[PDB]
Amino acid sequence: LQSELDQLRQEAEQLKNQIRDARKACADATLSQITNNIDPVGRIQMRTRRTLRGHLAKIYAMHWGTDSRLLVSASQDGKLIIWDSYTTNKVHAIPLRSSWVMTCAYAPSGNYVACGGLDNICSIYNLKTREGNVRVSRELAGHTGYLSCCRFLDDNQIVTSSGDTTCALWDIETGQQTTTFTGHTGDVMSLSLAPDTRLFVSGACDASAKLWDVREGMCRQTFTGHESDINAICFFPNGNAFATGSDDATCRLFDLRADQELMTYSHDNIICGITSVSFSKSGRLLLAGYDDFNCNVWDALKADRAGVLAGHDNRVSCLGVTDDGMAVATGSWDSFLKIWN
Amino acid sequence: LTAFVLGVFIKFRNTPIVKATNRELSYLLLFSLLCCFSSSLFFIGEPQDWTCRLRQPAFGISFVLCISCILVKTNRVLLVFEAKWGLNL
Amino acid sequence: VSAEDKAAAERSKMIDKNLREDGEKARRTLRLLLLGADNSGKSTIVKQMRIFETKFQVDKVNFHMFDVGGQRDERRKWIQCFNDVTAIIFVVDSSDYNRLQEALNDFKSIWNNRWLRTISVILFLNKQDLLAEKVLAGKSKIEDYFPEFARYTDPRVTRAKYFIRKEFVDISTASGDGRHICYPHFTCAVDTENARRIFNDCKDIILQMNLREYNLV
Amino acid sequence: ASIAQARKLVEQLKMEANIDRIKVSKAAADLMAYCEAHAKEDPLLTPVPASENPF
Numbered sequence: 113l114q115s116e117l118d119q120l121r122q123e124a125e126q127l128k129n130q131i132r133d134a135r136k137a138c139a140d141a142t143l144s145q146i147t148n149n150i151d152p153v154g155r156i157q158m159r160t161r162r163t164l165r166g167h168l169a170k171i172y173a174m175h176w177g178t179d180s181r182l183l184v185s186a187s188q189d190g191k192l193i194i195w196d197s198y199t200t201n202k203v204h205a206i207p208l209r210s211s212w213v214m215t216c217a218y219a220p221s222g223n224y225v226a227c228g229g230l231d232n233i234c235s236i237y238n239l240k241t242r243e244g245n246v247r248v249s250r251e252l253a254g255h256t257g258y259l260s261c262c263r264f265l266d267d268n269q270i271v272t273s274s275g276d277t278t279c280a281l282w283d284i285e286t287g288q289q290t291t292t293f294t295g296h297t298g299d300v301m302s303l304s305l306a307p308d309t310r311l312f313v314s315g316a317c318d319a320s321a322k323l324w325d326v327r328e329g330m331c332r333q334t335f336t337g338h339e340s341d342i343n344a345i346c347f348f349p350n351g352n353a354f355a356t357g358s359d360d361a362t363c364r365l366f367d368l369r370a371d372q373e374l375m376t377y378s379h380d381n382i383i384c385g386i387t388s389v390s391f392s393k394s395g396r397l398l399l400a401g402y403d404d405f406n407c408n409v410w411d412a413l414k415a416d417r418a419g420v421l422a423g424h425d426n427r428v429s430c431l432g433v434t435d436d437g438m439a440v441a442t443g444s445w446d447s448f449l450k451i452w453n
Numbered sequence: 454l455t456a457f458v459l460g461v462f463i464k465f466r467n468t469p470i471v472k473a474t475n476r477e478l479s480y481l482l483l484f485s486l487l488c489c490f491s492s493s494l495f496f497i498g499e500p501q502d503w504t505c506r507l508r509q510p511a512f513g514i515s516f517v518l519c520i521s522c523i524l525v526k527t528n529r530v531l532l533v534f535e536a537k538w539g540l541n542l
Numbered sequence: 543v544s545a546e547d548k549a550a551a552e553r554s555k556m557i558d559k560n561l562r563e564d565g566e567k568a569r570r571t572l573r574l575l576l577l578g579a580d581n582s583g584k585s586t587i588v589k590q591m592r593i594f595e596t597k598f599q600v601d602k603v604n605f606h607m608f609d610v611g612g613q614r615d616e617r618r619k620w621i622q623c624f625n626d627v628t629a630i631i632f633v634v635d636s637s638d639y640n641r642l643q644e645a646l647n648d649f650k651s652i653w654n655n656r657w658l659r660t661i662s663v664i665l666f667l668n669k670q671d672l673l674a675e676k677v678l679a680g681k682s683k684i685e686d687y688f689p690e691f692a693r694y695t696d697p698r699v700t701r702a703k704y705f706i707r708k709e710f711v712d713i714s715t716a717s718g719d720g721r722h723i724c725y726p727h728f729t730c731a732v733d734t735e736n737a738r739r740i741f742n743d744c745k746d747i748i749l750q751m752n753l754r755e756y757n758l759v
Numbered sequence: 760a761s762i763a764q765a766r767k768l769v770e771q772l773k774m775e776a777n778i779d780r781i782k783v784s785k786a787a788a789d790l791m792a793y794c795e796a797h798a799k800e801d802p803l804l805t806p807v808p809a810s811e812n813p814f
Binding site: 166167168169170188189191193196199200201202203204205210212214230231232256257258260275276298299301317341343 | 547550551553554557558560561562564565568593610612613614616618619620623626
């Protein structure tokens, strides 16, 4: 804060008016100029095909299995359930040490499941064991804030985002700390690993998201296009874009190579915030779980609502499309999971 | 007078004192009291056959309706004061 | 249906049976959230302790009081997890009038919360032992930091102690009626009816919520 | 404490500005190409036959 703050505060801004100028220079189109002639997806409708009941408290997270069949639901009752979407069977019911859990993830191999909440610890569970039950494999402590999103990189490394303004990557075998991604100025809420699993994005409560290099360790770029907290994030299937779901009643998407905001996806009649987002199979449909007990389906190219997913009497907190894009697994605070089409 | 009481009840439908008593059950009790008042008119006049058949049951049903409304209306409020019965039951 | 599928269905049925069994136990107890300031001494508010949670039962009904710790001074996102508790215990000590302004601003922020619009608060004014010895001498009065702390009704100690309660009830009844109501109490370090006051407040809270759920209020 | 600005003026700021950026057109009509080439394999835009659908 010395003479290098009447100097290096402007020089901390010189690279902001010379970045927005660089940013606003490479913009010869908006999304709705080359996606105007494409006919709309129509009034996309989707009825519920399987209602996975059984939870008591409100649902906070839900992750799809890689096999497009199993899924794991996290609720504030201290229970973790692995489902069989085809038959609505309950494969497992894993009790939790901490009754407050806000994260859940499925390992890509299907051998593990992670959870974490206000305990500031990611507990990773072993599904397939010779013992015949589900027991903790590791107790990933060393993080101060409450966990907000866990995602499995491989069978041995996991990426977590917490409320202490730090995204941060572990190694399950050692349980120690490999890389700590810092730079956010607020509670990080969401996480979305890239399909190539060499980068990821995270949205905090500072109206900004940062694309991190998981291999290297530093933020490649920061994306500021909102005005409130970002409590939802999801990655485009092609790996070159992603969407931000914020609580300011709008959900923007960004392009990694363009380093800009493409569309807003906002409606005047919608006032409630967004909780979760996901692209279905090709990025044309952007599922978005809102706060007014609904989940709009957005034609991403046209920025028009294609359908609604009403059927939850409480706010929708979970939203996830399956690997083959055959169904959705929206879950809400009414302790009810639902599968659509 | 009963009609006027009903009118001031409906005119002030959403009011904490009016809501303190069971509003729908109070409406039903007021209607039953109107019926009980009307049942007095059957006695006066020349005793016919129909008016003689519908004389005493007319008051009996209306008054038992009133007493049941009072009982159930003070039974719900008695049961909410519990330690830890319906909108249409 | 295959035999293996039949056995899987039976295993699932057992899973739901065991899950439902725990629901009765979860619903039997009552959940409380403890919060306040660092100097409030929230831990010694409940002198019988028996996320730092405690499990105390008075009059043979169990309460689980959760003291959130380690989190920063935001409470913006993890407070959107407790909108099912019976009440929130906001403990503030009145030992210093320099921080009572910050305390009442915090109470205003937490009372006028979107996710906490239908949940009530029980106000515990901790550390009433030294309020007398801070007002009996009068070497530093509340009127130095406030405009009109010059009228309220030892007599002097009580007239000094009821002004903060007047301010807090003014804040509570500023916005939000019926759904949630503050419960201003007075707690000491050696006071013994702290859990008793909590119970006597939450029974009335449950009574009010049942009155609204039966549509009688 | 020249660490709040250093990581925000020479670590992150000076690096984010030095990134090759393409015009937005080649990204808009690349997401468009990806979604157009994957329309047949998207079973939410075009519902699968009932027999094929497992639900």
